[PDB]
C-alpha cells in the first residue's frame with residue numbers, strides 16, 4: 001500500500017515531510033517545466049526562432 | 062455450545078469529540094484518549110510506565126511545585142487545574158489510553 | 174378586513190428566518206435596550222433562545238435550512254421578548270424625560 | 275509593441291496548470307478541515 005508507505009516514510013515525521021516537499025519540488029520543477037515548454041512548442045510548430053533558426057544559422061552567405 | 066467461551070464482535074474506535082456544555086457548573090471536566098492495545102499486549106507494561114512519568118495531581122499533594130511530574134509542576138506553578146490523572150483502561154480486544162483533568166473555565170486551554 | 178394580516182403573514186414568510194427555526198425576536202439586533210431586555214428573560218426562555226440561535230448559525234455555516242416541517246409557523250411564533258423590551262424602553266424614556274425637567 | 279508576447283503566453287500556460295492544480299488541492303484541504311463543523315451535530319438537552 002503506497003499510501004501507508006508514504007505515510008510512514010514521508011508524512012509522519014515533520015522532518016521527513018519537509019524533506020519530501022523540498023525534494024518533491026526539485027523534481028516537480030524539472031518535470032513540469034520540460035512538459036509545459038514541450039506543450040507550448042508543439043502548439044506553435046515552425047513559428048518560433050528555435051524552429052526557423054537553421055535557415056540563417058550557418059547556411060547563408 | 063455450553064462450554065465454549067463466546068468471542069465478542071470487535072468495537073471500532075473513533076477519533077471524535079462530544080461536548081456537553083453547562084456554564085452553570087463550577088468546574089469543567091475534560092478527558093482525552095487514544096485507542097489502547099487490550100489486556101494481552103505486552104506494550105501495556107510500557108504504557109503504564111509512560112503514565113507513571115506523567116502521573117497525577119490534585120491540589121492536596123504536598124509536594125507542590127517540587128513534584129517530579131512536569132505536568133504536575135506546571136499545574137502548580139500556573140494554577141492549571143484542580144486535578145488530573147492518566148489512565149490505561151484495558152479490555153479484551155481494545156482499550157483507552159488517555160488523561161482526564163478538572164479545571165476552572167479560564168485555565169482549560171493552558172492545561173490541555 | 175384582513176389586509177394587514179395578509180401582508181404581515183406574507184412578509185413573515187418572505188423574510189425567511191423561520192426556515193432556520195428562529196422566532197422573530199431571535200432576529201433582533203442587540204442594541205442597548207435589547208441587551209437589557211435579554212438580561213431579564215427567565216432562564217428557560219434564555220436557554221431556548223440560545224439554542225435556536227446556535228442552531229441557526231450552524232445551519233448557516235452549513236448552507237442548509239431546516240426541513241419544511243420544522244419551520245416556525247407565522248401564527249406559532251412566540252414574541253417572548255417584546256414584553257420586556259417595551260418595558261425597558263418605557264423606563265428609559267421616563268428617565269430621559271425626567272433628567273430633562 | 276510587446277517583445278514579451280511569446281514568453282508572456284508561455285507563462286500563462288504554466289500559471290493555468292499550476293493554478294488548476296493548486297486550487298483543487300487547497301479546495302480539498304479547506305474542505306478536509308471544515309468537515310468537522312460541516313458534519314457536526316448538536317442537541318438541546320434541558321433538565322426539563
Ligand SMILES: CCCCCCCCO[C@@H]1O[C@H](CO)[C@@H](O)[C@H](O)[C@H]1O
Nearest residue numbers: 037281284285288289290292293296
Ligand atoms: C498561482 C501560482 C502561479 C505560479 C506560476 C509560476 C509559473 C512561472 O514560470 C515562469 O515561466 C517562464 C516561461 O517559461 C520562465 O521564463 C520563468 O523563469 C518562470 O519562472
